[PDB]
Design an enzyme around this catalytic site. Structure first.
Site, PDB file in Angstrom:
ATOM      1  N   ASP A 207       0.934  -1.417   0.216  1.00 36.63           N
ATOM      2  CA  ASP A 207       0.129  -0.026  -0.082  1.00 36.63           C
ATOM      3  C   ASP A 207       0.805   1.193   0.198  1.00 36.63           C
ATOM      4  O   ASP A 207       2.205   1.103   0.099  1.00 36.63           O
ATOM      5  CB  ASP A 207      -1.134  -0.030   1.103  1.00 36.63           C
ATOM      6  CG  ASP A 207       0.017   0.299   2.472  1.00 36.63           C
ATOM      7  OD1 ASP A 207       0.786  -0.555   2.882  1.00 36.63           O
ATOM      8  OD2 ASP A 207      -0.771   0.980   3.546  1.00 36.63           O
ATOM      9  N   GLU A 210       3.273   1.607   2.645  1.00 32.93           N
ATOM     10  CA  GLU A 210       4.321   0.990   2.414  1.00 32.93           C
ATOM     11  C   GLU A 210       4.636  -0.328   3.631  1.00 32.93           C
ATOM     12  O   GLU A 210       5.572  -0.780   4.041  1.00 32.93           O
ATOM     13  CB  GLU A 210       5.920   1.625   2.595  1.00 32.93           C
ATOM     14  CG  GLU A 210       5.797   2.955   1.747  1.00 32.93           C
ATOM     15  CD  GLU A 210       6.946   3.549   1.627  1.00 32.93           C
ATOM     16  OE1 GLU A 210       7.725   4.254   2.220  1.00 32.93           O
ATOM     17  OE2 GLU A 210       7.558   2.922   0.597  1.00 32.93           O
TER      18      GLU A 210
END
Length: 492
Positions: A207, A210
């Site tokens: 995402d 991270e």
């Protein structure tokens, strides 16, 4: 530490007045945004032109890298500045250096892969070193939002070149630059990113924060936008079959975003579940500021946006409201804010800015939270569109915007309330939306550093800034909030 940071000289935020603060930050936050972009005419004249650092912090934390996401989002703000200031050539050149550096990064092999892998697998790489070399350490890779945001930003520049500068690029005769024409930019930089999205949208990556792998609303949403927005670009370069591929893929991604397999629209809790796999794992319940940040990024206030999940979407707006309510209880700094408040990433967050303990509100999330009601108001007033409020969102409107019973006393017996353009109540709702947005910018005024720079985070107890210093994305988010505020307030 952030040794290359240069404060805006002899400026101290005036805590007493929002209007003057925002007027000054229109300049000061732009100074700080540009300082993190390498271009020959900038303060960062010793970096490779087109490099954007996420932050000058090189330790505690070390954010001195270029992320595909942060660079693209930064350049969306540069493009707004370009568009609002007569195609300023200094900014245009900065964009073209970024496009050129993007070309080079695309062709840089890295732990996610290479340009010659199937559909340019290497383009999923989240970040690179500032010298342009691959970051070879372990990381949450790939992140499939980056190529989408970059395709969109560079596509927008091409549209601006055509609409505002008579089709003329500005670095065409420079030695260092890997394009001679707008078609070259499309074929060699935009199109590979679109091919990556076509090839990898329905695959697993991390995402935008991270941290988690799986399905992500923000990632799918920005991908859908990049594909949709590029259709007309492809058509303009006689790439018609590919244009139709883009259109069909965009439609299919729109269906994915709204359907059962995606898992984002959840009718049990009536909000977006940002990361549905984490709901399944019972590690997160789905509230995330990415849910409204994505919509803001993918519906520009000058564009016609014909893409799904604008901020008026009932599930997006309910995620927004519920995160606000969560954060007003979660963070003690919010204990005295009756309207907007300091907003974080997600309720389960433990990232403290330089380690793990408990998460904090973020300046960027708080600035984007101002934008949500500004955009609801702007969209309605600028187009003379009605404001339709679904029953899912009644609690939000009743609490912060308007008492719906004063508009329609029987509203609880209806699936929606439609507030008609031109009516007194429409004007009141639009005004109250803007006042509500302002309350989030007041939180920023209360807690920004004296020097006018925005960190990544502000402490959940005191609101004192913490984490990465002068985060470019923070600067951009505030600049876009001010731009939107001024645009809606300027309407008669």
């Amino acid at each position: 530490a952030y040794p290359s940071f240069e404060a805006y000289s002899n400026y101290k935020v005036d805590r007493t007045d929002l209007e003057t603060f925002l007027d000054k930050q229109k300049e000061v936050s732009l100074y700080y945004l540009l300082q993190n972009i390498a271009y020959p005419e900038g303060q960062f004249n010793n970096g490779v032109p087109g490099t954007v650092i996420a932050s000058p912090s090189t330790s505690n934390p070390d954010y001195y890298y270029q992320w595909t996401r942060d660079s693209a989002i930064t350049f969306l703000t540069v493009l707004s500045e370009l568009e609002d200031n007569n195609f300023n050539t200094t900014l245009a050149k900065a964009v073209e250096y970024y496009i050129n550096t993007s070309y080079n990064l695309q062709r840089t092999s890295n732990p996610s892969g290479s340009f010659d892998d199937e559909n340019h697998k290497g383009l999923g790489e989240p970040k690179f070193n500032t010298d342009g070399s691959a970051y070879t350490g372990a990381w949450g890779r790939p992140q499939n939002d980056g190529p989408a945001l970059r395709a969109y930003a560079i596509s927008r520049y091409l549209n601006d070149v055509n609409s505002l500068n008579e089709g003329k690029l500005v670095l065409t005769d420079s030695g260092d630059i890997n394009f001679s024409s707008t078609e070259d930019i499309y074929k060699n930089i935009i199109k590979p990113d679109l091919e990556y999205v076509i090839g990898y949208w329905d695959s697993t990556g991390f995402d935008l924060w991270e941290e988690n792998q799986g399905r992500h609303f923000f990632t799918s949403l920005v991908q859908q936008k990049a594909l949709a927005y590029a259709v007309d670009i492809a058509k303009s370069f006689d790439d018609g079959d590919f244009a139709n591929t883009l259109s069909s893929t965009a439609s299919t991604l729109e269906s994915y975003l709204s359907g059962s397999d995606g898992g984002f629209v959840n009718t049990d809790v009536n909000h977006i579940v940002e990361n549905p796999d984490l709901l399944q794992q019972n590690s997160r319940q789905g509230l995330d500021s990415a849910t409204y940040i994505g919509p803001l990024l993918t519906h520009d206030i000058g564009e016609s946006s014909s893409t799904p999940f604008d901020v008026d979407n009932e599930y997006v707006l309910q995620s927004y409201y519920l995160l606000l309510e969560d954060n007003k209880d979660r963070y003690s700094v919010n204990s005295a804010y009756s309207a907007g408040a300091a907003i974080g990433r997600y309720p389960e967050d433990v990232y403290n800015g330089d380690g793990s303990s408990e998460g904090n509100p973020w300046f960027l999330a708080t600035a984007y939270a101002a934008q949500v009601p500004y955009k609801l108001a702007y969209d309605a007033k600028s187009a003379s569109n009605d404001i339709t409020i679904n029953k899912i969102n009644y609690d939000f409107f009743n609490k912060y915007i308007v008492d719906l019973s004063t508009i329609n006393s029987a509203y609880q017996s209806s699936d929606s309330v439609t507030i008609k353009s031109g009516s007194d109540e429409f004007n009141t709702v639009a005004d109250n939306l803007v006042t509500f947005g302002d309350s989030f910018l007041q939180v920023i005024l209360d807690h920004i550093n004296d020097d006018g720079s925005l960190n990544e985070q502000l402490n959940r107890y005191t609101g004192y800034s913490t984490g990465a210093y002068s985060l470019t994305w923070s600067s951009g988010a505030l600049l876009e909030a001010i731009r939107l505020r001024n645009k809606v307030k300027a309407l008669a």
